[PDB]
Design a protein around this ligand. Structure first.
Ligand SMILES: CCCCCCCCCCCC
Lengths: 54, 109, 54
């Protein structure tokens, strides 16, 4: 929750921005309270906890 | 406490083929053959991107890359069908998949 | 670099993030075509073999 709040305040990335969050890369679909959803270039959806991202 | 790679979430996914041919194979002919192969499959979404072009100059072959989108239910089937058709067309057309190559210089004959 | 079987050249060029992959592919194809037409040859793995007990 704290990591998600920080990611919402400081914006290292936004919905629609290609990123590489520690070994996983893909367009960011949405940032939520507990985790954010990205869609890899292959076409699969990946959900990452915000704490791990931060 | 870890990533959750969801697959059944998106109804459409992508297939990637890596085809390695000899260094004498005509690039235009290979590209045209691959384009004809992937344009005759009805399970490959034509709206998405269909990329087929030279991707690398390998040690013994030049690797081409083919990328095509299809419904998640037809991914493996289209992969298998396209691979078999690629092999058949390349065999019939003349293109050759090369064995590992090596130049040997003789000495002390 | 002076590789085991070849001398590796390095080419570095800047382009807009939207044209990165396309320029990569186009430049690679043009490089192959020009080298084939010019005479330059991409070498297969090489090895010197000394015969004995002929
Ligand atoms: C559950 C905890 C929510 C608050 C997390 C800390 C946010 C601090 C922001 C400080 C910005 C200067």
């Amino acid at each position: 929750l704290a990591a998600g709040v920080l990611l919402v305040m400081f914006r290292p990335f936004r919905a629609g921005e290609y990123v590489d969050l520690g070994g996983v890369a893909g367009t960011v679909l949405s940032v939520q309270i507990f985790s954010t959803t990205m869609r890899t270039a292959d076409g699969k959806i990946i959900v990452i906890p915000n704490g791990k991202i931060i | 406490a870890g990533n959750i790679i969801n697959f059944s979430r998106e109804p459409v996914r992508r297939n990637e083929f890596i085809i390695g041919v000899a260094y004498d194979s005509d690039i235009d002919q290979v590209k045209q053959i691959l384009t004809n192969i992937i344009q005759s499959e009805d399970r490959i979404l034509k709206d998405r991107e269909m990329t087929v072009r030279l991707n690398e100059l390998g040690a013994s072959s030049i690797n081409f890359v083919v990328r095509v989108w299809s419904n998640s239910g037809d991914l493996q089937n289209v992969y298998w069908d396209v691979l078999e058709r690629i092999k058949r067309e390349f065999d019939a057309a003349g293109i050759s998949f090369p064995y590992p190559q090596m130049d040997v210089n003789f000495k002390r004959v």
